[PDB]
């Protein structure tokens, strides 16, 4: 088989998550959020930082709030944003929250 440049090591489907016919769509829905939000931003890549772009401390909640409507109550938090500023990374995190889905109802005072 292929020859040249060695590099064999256990690992079936690793590094970054793999979207899906569906997830892909969702990933695109989230993209619209960034775009819609970030004005100057003409395009949103996996290298586009939600911060560097031109997002404020409100967009953080907005993006989280927006994506929330995507999953309809996505278990996201400002932290997530502070963790995954870039779309590419964020997606992975999002997709992760998406894949999981379903939350564990707590005490909820109100």
Method: NMR
Q: What is the CATH number of domain 21-101?
A: 1.10.1200.10
| Distance from C-alpha of 8 to C-alpha of 87, rounded to nearest angstrom | 30
- Only one residue has tokens 């090591």, namely 9
Alpha-carbon distances, residue 30 vs 8, 77, 86, 104 (angstroms): 36, 15, 12, 24
């Amino acid at each position: 088989g292929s020859s040249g440049s060695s590099g064999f090591f256990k690992g079936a489907a690793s590094s970054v998550l793999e979207l899906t016919e569906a997830e892909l769509v969702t990933a695109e829905a989230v993209r619209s959020v960034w775009q819609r939000i970030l004005p100057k931003v003409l395009e949103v890549e996996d290298s586009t930082d939600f911060f560097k772009s031109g997002a404020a401390s409100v967009d953080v909640v907005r993006l989280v709030e927006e994506v929330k409507e995507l999953c309809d109550g996505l278990e996201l938090e400002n932290e997530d944003v502070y963790m995954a500023s870039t779309f590419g990374d964020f997606i992975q995190l999002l997709v992760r929250k998406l894949r999981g889905d379903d939350e564990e109802s707590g005490p909820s005072s109100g």
